[PDB]
Amino acid sequence: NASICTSEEWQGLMQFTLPVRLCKEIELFHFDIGPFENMWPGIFVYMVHRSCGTSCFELEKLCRFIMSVKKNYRRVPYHNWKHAVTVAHCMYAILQNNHTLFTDLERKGLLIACLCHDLDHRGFSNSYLQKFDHPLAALYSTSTMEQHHFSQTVSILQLEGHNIFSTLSSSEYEQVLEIIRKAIIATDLALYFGNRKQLEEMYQTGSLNLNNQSHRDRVIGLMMTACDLCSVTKLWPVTKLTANDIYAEFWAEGDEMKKLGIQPIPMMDRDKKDEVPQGQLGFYNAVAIPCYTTLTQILPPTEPLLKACRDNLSQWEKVI
Ligand SMILES: [Mg+2]
Ligand SMILES: [Zn+2]
């Protein structure tokens, strides 16, 4: 059931070359991929090559994988191909600034998990799917969409000539799929709260130990949240435009809820737009700021994400 790219598509990617001007910009946390749509697949290739090495994956398999991933994202307002590449770019910036803290297997796994983290999203929340007994909610009792996204990731790797992980030892192969599974599951914001609280405690008591697998899993989980929410770390006009896409998706869900006779939550109600700035302020205070604060404590080089998030918080305050 997984879509396949065309030969023309992956061969096009193989020949793509990244303009020199962008090489310096892509390294920055605040970089916005927005104006370079045609370059998105090539930007990912470039990031994999810079982080993992030009020989880490067989170029042909990597290009097929990327173009098929693109094909498996829907034309929804927010949880689409653009969001996947944006999240992958933030991961790249985090990894580049903390390079040696992560294994080569983790870097490959995380960049891939980010590209795939919202695969085949339908524009509906786990709350909606569960409330209206969608087949997916029956299959996946908790972290509904996230379990689906990982299932889709595996489905793509199984496609002819798409298994970029085939050269890994049987042990490393199982390890990378676990890194990916955990990383994708971690993008369920419901799990973020507990993870952040635990990490803050470990950090403050000085018990945090990155050679402890369970601790690494938690740090990786917080990195996933940080990447997933990164629109809040861009330049204000970019942050503002992305919020428009987020809300366009939310309001469409809210519209469906009204048809089913249920009044939607304010965030999904298109008739409550004037309350958006307060809603944003609330989210930054309760979710975004704590996320980047704990991430900065654990990985000091990620401080520019927290600074940018704080600047945007100030912008929402100006709106109010
Ligand atoms: Mg998601
Ligand atoms: Zn996402």
Curated annotation (Swiss-Prot):
Localization of this protein:
Cytoplasm, Cytosol
As annotated, the protein's associated disorder is: Dyskinesia, limb and orofacial, infantile-onset: An autosomal recessive, early-onset hyperkinetic movement disorder characterized by axial hypotonia, dyskinesia of the limbs and trunk, orofacial dyskinesia, drooling, and dysarthria. The severity of the hyperkinesis is variable.
Oligomeric state and interaction partners are given as: Homodimer.
Which residues take part in binding 3',5'-cyclic AMP? Answer: 79, 280
Q: What is the effect of changing residue 118 to N?
A: Reduces activity 1000-fold
Q: What is this protein called?
A: cAMP and cAMP-inhibited cGMP 3',5'-cyclic phosphodiesterase 10A
Question: Which residues are annotated as active site?
Answer: 79
Specify the superkingdom: Eukaryota
Q: Which residues form the PDEase domain?
A: 6-320
Summarize where a divalent metal cation 2 binds, as residue positions: 118
Q: What does this protein do?
A: Plays a role in signal transduction by regulating the intracellular concentration of cyclic nucleotides. Can hydrolyze both cAMP and cGMP, but has higher affinity for cAMP and is more efficient with cAMP as substrate. May play a critical role in regulating cAMP and cGMP levels in the striatum, a region of the brain that contributes to the control of movement and cognition.
Positions of 3',5'-cyclic GMP binding? 79, 280
Q: Which organism was this protein described from?
A: Homo sapiens
Q: Which residues form a coiled coil?
A: none
Q: Which of this chain's residues are annotated to bind a divalent metal cation 1?
A: 83, 117-118, 228
Tissue expression from the record: Abundant in the putamen and caudate nucleus regions of brain and testis, moderately expressed in the thyroid gland, pituitary gland, thalamus and cerebellum.
Q: What is known of its domains?
A: The tandem GAF domains bind cAMP, and regulate enzyme activity. The binding of cAMP stimulates enzyme activity.
The family this protein is said to belong to: Belongs to the cyclic nucleotide phosphodiesterase family.
Q: Which cysteines are joined by disulfide bonds?
A: none
